[PDB]
């Protein structure tokens, strides 16, 4: 009748701009995992995440991972603008061989790992105004060392703390020192957080240890872009409506195929 009960099992690359993350998740692309750096500054109507994607950098968690994912996914871009943070008194550009960028050590491209310089680590107090007419998205993190000895060797202070403020948000994080299961060789962890700065607002960062610093901001847009988890191959054909199962005809008013859809689709109808 006029419930669409079949899909093709493939995802058409037209008319929508489809971006395949073969081996990369959107968050991993956002952070700049070295095997994901081909995605720098990429845009998309629909980002397609595969179940064969893997992280190959510093082990990390994102509190509210789903929300960061969906907001980047709906913005439709990874436009990153590098900004001139001044990190006085610390060593910048820390890397780890659990995240190689070729021969030597590496880190996420969009993050700046700060450690002591000499044997002091000062209280960083940095500001970054937003004088533009758009929303700035800042990604940053905090390092959770395995042991008290590792905490003191990297950041001097026995206990660190990160505080990021706007006038519309406040994020104060203290590291959680402790041993985690070996992941790609590491017992330590990084936690990732994010901060939106509206025009005329100013980003404030204060830290006496464990700060993983931002390098700049991602240009926030307001889009009809989105993201989808699917293993359907991408074919060069035409379809206005896409599901994780593949493309579907959109002439019939309804569809049994999947509640998740992108494009001008018939309505899901519970069979």
């Amino acid at each position: 009748e006029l419930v669409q009960s079949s899909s093709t099992g493939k995802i058409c690359n037209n008319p929508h701009r489809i971006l395949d993350g073969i081996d990369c998740t959107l968050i991993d692309a956002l952070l700049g995992d070295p095997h994901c750096d081909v995605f720098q500054n990429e845009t998309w109507d629909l980002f397609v995440e595969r179940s064969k994607a893997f992280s190959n950098c510093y082990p990390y968690d994102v509190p509210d991972y789903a929300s960061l994912r969906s907001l980047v996914a709906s913005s439709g871009t990874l436009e990153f603008i590098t900004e001139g943070f001044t990190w006085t008194g610390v060593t910048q550009n820390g890397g780890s061989n659990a995240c190689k960028r070729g021969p030597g050590s590496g880190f996420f491209s969009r993050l700046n790992w700060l450690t002591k310089s000499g044997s002091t680590y000062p209280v960083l107090n940095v500001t970054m105004p937003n004088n533009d007419n758009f929303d700035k998205l800042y990604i940053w993190g905090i390092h959770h060392p395995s042991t008290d000895q590792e905490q003191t060797s990297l950041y001097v202070q026995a206990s660190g703390r990160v505080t990021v403020s706007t006038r519309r948000s406040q994020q104060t994080i203290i590291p959680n020192i402790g041993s985690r299961p070996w992941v790609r060789g590491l017992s330590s962890r990084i936690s990732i957080y994010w901060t939106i700065v509206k025009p005329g607002d100013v980003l404030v960062i204060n830290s006496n240890g464990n700060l993983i610093a931002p390098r700049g901001y991602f240009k926030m847009r307001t889009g009809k872009s989105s993201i989808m988890r699917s293993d359907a191959p991408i074919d060069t054909c035409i379809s206005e409506c896409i599901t994780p199962n593949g493309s579907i005809p959109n002439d019939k008013p309804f569809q049994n195929v999947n509640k998740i859809t992108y494009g001008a689709c018939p309505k899901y109808v519970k069979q």
Partner: antibody
Amino acid sequence: QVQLVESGGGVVQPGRSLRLSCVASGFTFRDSVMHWVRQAPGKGLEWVAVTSFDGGESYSADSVKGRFTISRDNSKSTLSLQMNILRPEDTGVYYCARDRGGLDVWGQGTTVTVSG
Amino acid sequence: DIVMTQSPESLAVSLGERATINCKSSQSVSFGSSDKNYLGWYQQKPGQPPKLLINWASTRESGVSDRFRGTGSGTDFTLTISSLQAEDAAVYYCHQYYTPPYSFGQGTKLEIKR
């Protein structure tokens, strides 16, 4: 002395559940990653699950994902394995083991027989 | 997911000769191009829990005899028992703890040749 003692094994019907427990002694239990490994009769070692110092991160093998849950109780120095929807192929001796990179301390194990 | 493959599955060695068990991992279990290798060797005799013999591919555990040696770095690993004694008869296992899911080799039965 440094010791782990497992408990809770038994004969259980398929599809049922039972909870294994391991009590640690003679070391700072709360500071150690802890594992469950098992071994079916006449078969090789099979890694089951692992959990961080605080129970905040765990991992389990794909043969048990969705069915077995690992947790600890640092105030009782107690590792746990909650086993749901048991199947005959889950039969084996289950060990709790401390991580020192390579698993340097093991209990004597507790035996689970899943059968009708 | 990293898979461990041991070799041979079964081995017979005369008393006082050397034994050699081989272990291969499907992906590297080394930290960088470092010498840190997340690889353990175990010995298990009937009715007993395994015993960690070698840690970090080469480091002999406390109380383990001189005769046991391990090496390798990356994917290929070797365990040696140099002047075989009757107490050595047992199953040996390798084990990767680089990244989860962790996993054991399938086991190698070392028996006394007569």
